Write a protein that binds this ligand. Structure first.
Ligand SMILES: [Mg+2]
Ligand SMILES: [Mg+2]
Ligand SMILES: [Mg+2]
Ligand SMILES: [Mg+2]
Ligand SMILES: [Mg+2]
Ligand SMILES: [Mg+2]
Lengths: 65, 402, 119
RNA sequence: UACGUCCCUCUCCAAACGAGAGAACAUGCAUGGGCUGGCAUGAGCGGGGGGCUCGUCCCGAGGCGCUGAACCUUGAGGCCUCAUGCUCAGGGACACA
RNA sequence: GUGAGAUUGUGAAGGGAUCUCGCAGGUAUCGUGAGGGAAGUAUGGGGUAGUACGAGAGGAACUCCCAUGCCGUGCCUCUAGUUUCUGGGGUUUGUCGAACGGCAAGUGCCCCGAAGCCAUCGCACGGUGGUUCUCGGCUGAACGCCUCUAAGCCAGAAGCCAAUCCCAAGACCAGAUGCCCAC
RNA sequence: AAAGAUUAUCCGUAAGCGGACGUGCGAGCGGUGGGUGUACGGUACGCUCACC
RNA sequence: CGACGUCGCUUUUUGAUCCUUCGAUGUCGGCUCUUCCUAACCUAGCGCCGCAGAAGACGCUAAGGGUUGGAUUGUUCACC
RNA sequence: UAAUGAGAUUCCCUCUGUCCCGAGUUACUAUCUAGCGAAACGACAGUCAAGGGAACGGACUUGAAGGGCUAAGCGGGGAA
RNA sequence: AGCAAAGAUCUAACGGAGAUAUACUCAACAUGCAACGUUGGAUACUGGAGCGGGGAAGGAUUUCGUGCCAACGGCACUCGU
């Protein structure tokens, strides 16, 4: 298949691993959002930015490189 | 008075008695029907369960909604070191049954074969197969070998060979047994003179799993269920649990019978042993007969997925270790926990349905971790997410300091 | 094998003393909270008892204080512990009596510590 | 008489207790290392709303840096022999009028 | 005959007779399979086909694929659930003088959480032969023709019986075997 | 269940037919011993003790 | 299909009785769970029709398997 | 008839393991040991099918089973 | 059957007959276990509507020291109303 990357943390979501999700306010480009953990979906529900969480790829590309 | 509404009864009544298995190993109670027009070949092989994982493959099924589309199927990994043949038995038909004529032995038996005869091998005299070894090459014993080989050719209709799992090539730390698992494998194909010549030729020689099965076939898996102790009626039989305000308890069967017949029946569900039962579970499609890591350092690599990786996941199969030998990979689940010996036997079902004739090509084998959530497929991918960490930058500081 | 290719000397003397870490979390996992410090004394008496081949094991209040210093359910994950084997027999016994006095070694970090014989 | 079996000891595919699978100087057990995962950046030290003192120096939640740090990781029982410790003629009972 | 015991109601060392049974098996593995159990059952779609049939209105079916409901046996890769790994952290009140480390609140509470267990809340699998009922027939008389029946045959139900499947020699297996002993 | 079921080595089929250590010293089929490579790591195959 | 008649089967109704129990057989309906029976609603084969097809009436062999979710009612029943 | 009610009833909102449909964890039991140690109950006892019988037998008639002894359950019988 | 409410005990030294109790050719584990009191130490609890300190009613020597363990204190006791 293909390796989707997570919406919150941009982890690697290899086939048969994550859990996809589609909200009522859906984007035309990303209708369905792929998540790798429940911890990724939990920080998506409380509406945290992907940056300011130190273990996501958004943080590690703006602070540490 | 009749039962007011109808449900189908709980539990298949043909798997009674639901008592513990008499032996831990899978044992075939019936081999496939002997086609004497075929070529002589073995019919079963013992493998050990080594966790499970999932794959990705595209589907050739014309008419289906998933035709030429990729599915994710769960597969179970079963490690298969080769079995060494040590004997040849032969059985003759009687109106009572099927009587054993005799057994020849191999003239050379393994330490772990004749370990099966001892409850304590290391604190023993270890002199089993020691007078048979020296009588077999006397004048009278070379006669008696050929005496009972001829008695196979006269009386036997069923020729079987005796193999054992060869556990020292299974370099596994958690399968703690050191004596070998012994079973009989039936020869099917040809006449009895053509079976014995295949039984003589592979005697004191190891037989490998890809000489018994092919890559995209099915098989039966005789195996013993994972044990769960004494369980009550809701866990064991699947009865409905009673309403919350019930006195003395919920997880019970309310009525265990009428006034008359004034006895409890065998059909009424009761509590007792759940698990550790023998099951045969036909039509387990095989997807990959693997090859040892000494031959193949790249086992899970596909044509369509060129990542150089083995079948063993990151951090090993949980509770098992590493698959160090040949392996078969079957679609779905097999009855039993990891580390348990299981018997792959050739099918008795007609293998003519179009689901079972289907040739399998894979596209992906999940080699991610089974501890936690699997995220990386190789350790090369975790060293590219994570750069040099702290423990790496002080190991690189000791390596410059020397 | 590997146990045959060992550089095995005779017995160690009757007064030997060694330091060892005992990972206590592997012995106290899902035990009831009101007895994790009572039966962590027993898991130390059994640890050094099948190690020094003794039935008399003495806890030597530095060690009793250490496994109880966080209450009955806050037993630490590890203790670095000092075994000392001795010999003292009541006059008239047909067999020789060994005892073990186990005490605390404070280390402040349990990483990189293996079993060593002291004195 | 011997082969042996069983108990005690160890392991957990088994398990209410028995029984079972095993092992019995064996990477067997113990601790450590590495892996694998979990959480989410440790103690300590150093350079922001405002507010004291006589440009400077102190009080101040928070923040930033060392720091994907610190800790935990098999244990009713994850992985690797990756290193070292520990064993020093295993002990009892039957087999045996 | 040879070994081993006992003759215990009134003191003791002796040794007569008599009675009781011991005098051959033990241990370990691979199988047999009588007998008993017993299971899978339904549905929709595709096309066949807008065809057969019919004035038109209307309107089929089998092979053959694809799925699914109910049930059954498992399983834990995924997803979901569960956490006394009180694992890591966060937070409140009290309390060790403060930080540190914690602790108390029958697991303080909140978030994430391995492993294990587990859900039609996920996943995998669920197969052969005959006998013969209804019945339709074939030859064929009784009854010089006729007739499925009287003799005899054919085909044949989700029934019934076996195969597979589960337990299995109090089904007492001179079934086979490894090693000791005893003849 | 074997076929002397009347004495006695087996093999293979009934008519046939293959050979079977010779006399304490020998030999033969053999279980375990010393040194320089072969088949799918360590077990086999080359070149002192029992039995005939 | 079948009046007038007539011969009967059934013991899931009720009446009639008073045999057993009053030094006690716990007296309804749900819920649960298993099994049985056939007078067969669905499913397997069928015959026959005032059976063209489609739906269906009647019958035969068969009880192997299946036979629900609800509103009201304490309800069996009833009723949507 | 406002206010009041551990009063009787009905609907709606929120709410949820009441349910679909169950699963998993905890403390305490059960369970195993050490010490201690009862009661209810007890004609005798205790495997069934049919027949008959005071017309629902553990014992009688004819059949069908049944080697002995145990541990944990369990609620069909003992018209317990 | 049970002796399952009222969180809970651990440690060392002494005391005590209550031990460290062994027919050989045995180094110890695998052949004397369990349980008692006191002081020290650790850990808890009650939490001032207290398992705190005094009175009535009721009891009438249960008070106190010293000995002591037959029976009693439903387990135990070297302790004891
Ligand atoms: Mg288990
Ligand atoms: Mg049968
Ligand atoms: Mg009032
Ligand atoms: Mg109790
Ligand atoms: Mg308090
Ligand atoms: Mg008492």
């Amino acid at each position: 298949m293909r390796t989707i990357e997570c919406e919150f943390s941009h982890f690697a979501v290899h086939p048969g691993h994550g859990r996809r999700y589609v909200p009522f306010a859906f984007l035309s480009t990303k209708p369905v959002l792929t998540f790798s953990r429940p911890k990724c979906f939990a920080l998506y529900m409380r509406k945290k930015n992907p940056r300011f969480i130190p273990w996501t790829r958004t943080y590690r590309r703006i602070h540490r490189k | 008075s009749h039962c007011k509404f109808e449900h189908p009864r709980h539990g298949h009544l043909g798997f009674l008695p639901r008592k513990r298995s008499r032996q831990i190993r899978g044992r075939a109670r019936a081999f496939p029907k002997d086609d004497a027009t075929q070529k002589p070949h073995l019919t079963s092989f013992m493998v050990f369960k080594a966790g499970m994982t999932h794959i990705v493959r595209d589907v050739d099924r014309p008419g289906s909604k998933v035709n030429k589309k990729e599915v994710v199927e769960p597969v179970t990994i079963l490690e298969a070191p080769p079995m060494v043949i040590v004997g040849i038995v032969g059985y003759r038909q009687t109106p009572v049954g099927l009587k054993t004529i005799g057994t020849v032995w191999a003239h050379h038996t393994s330490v772990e074969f004749r370990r099966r005869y001892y409850k304590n091998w290391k604190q023993s005299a270890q002199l089993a197969f020691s007078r048979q070894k020296q009588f077999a090459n006397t004048k009278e014993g070379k006669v008696a070998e050929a005496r009972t080989l001829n008695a196979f050719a006269k009386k036997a209709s069923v020729i079987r060979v005796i193999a054992h799992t060869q556990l020292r090539k299974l370099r596994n730390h958690r399968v703690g047994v050191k004596k070998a698992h012994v079973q009989e494998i039936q020869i099917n194909g040809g006449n009895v003179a053509a079976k014995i010549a295949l039984a003589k030729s592979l005697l004191e020689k190891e037989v490998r799993v890809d000489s018994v099965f092919q890559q995209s076939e099915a098989c039966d898996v005789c195996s013993v269920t994972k044990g769960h102790g004494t369980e009550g009626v809701v866990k064991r039989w699947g009865v409905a649990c009673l309403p919350r305000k019930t006195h003395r308890g919920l997880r019970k069967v309310a009525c265990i019978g009428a006034w008359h017949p004034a006895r409890v029946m065998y059909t009424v569900a009761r509590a007792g042993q759940h698990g550790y039962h023998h099951r045969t579970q036909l039509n387990k499609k095989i997807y990959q007969i693997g090859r040892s890591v000494a031959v193949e350092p790249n086992q899970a690599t596909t044509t369509y997925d060129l990542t150089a990786k083995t079948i063993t996941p990151m951090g090993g199969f949980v509770g098992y270790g590493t698959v160090r030998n040949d392996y078969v990979m079957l679609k779905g689940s097999v009855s039993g926990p990891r580390r348990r010996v299981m018997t792959l036997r050739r099918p008795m079902a007609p293998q003519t349905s179009r689901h079972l004739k289907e040739k399998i090509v894979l596209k992906f084998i999940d080699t991610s971790s089974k501890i936690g959530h699997g995220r990386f497929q190789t350790k090369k991918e975790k060293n590219q997410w994570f750069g040099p960490l702290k423990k790496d930058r002080i190991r690189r500081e000791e390596r410059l300091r020397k | 094998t590997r146990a045959s290719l060992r550089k095995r000397t005779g017995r160690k003397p009757d007064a030997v003393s060694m330091e060892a870490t005992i990972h206590l979390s592997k012995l106290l996992k899902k035990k009831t909270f009101s007895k994790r410090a009572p039966l962590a004394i027993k898991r130390i008496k059994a640890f050094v008892g099948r190690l020094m081949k003794t039935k008399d094991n003495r806890i030597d209040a530095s060690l009793n204080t250490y496994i109880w210093h966080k209450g009955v359910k806050g037993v630490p994950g590890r203790v670095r512990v000092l075994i000392q084997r001795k010999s003292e027999t009541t006059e008239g016994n047909k067999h020789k009596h060994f005892y073990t006095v186990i005490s605390n070694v404070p280390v402040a970090s349990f990483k990189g510590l293996t079993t060593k014989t002291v004195e």
